[PDB]
Amino acid sequence: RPPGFSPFR
């Protein structure tokens, strides 16, 4: 869970 991560599914 890195910084600036985006939503999935």
DSSP letters of 1-9? --TT-----
Identify residue 2 by its one-letter amino acid code: P
Method of elucidation = NMR
Tokens at residue 4, please?
């600036």
Task: Name the residue with tokens 């991560």.
Answer: 5
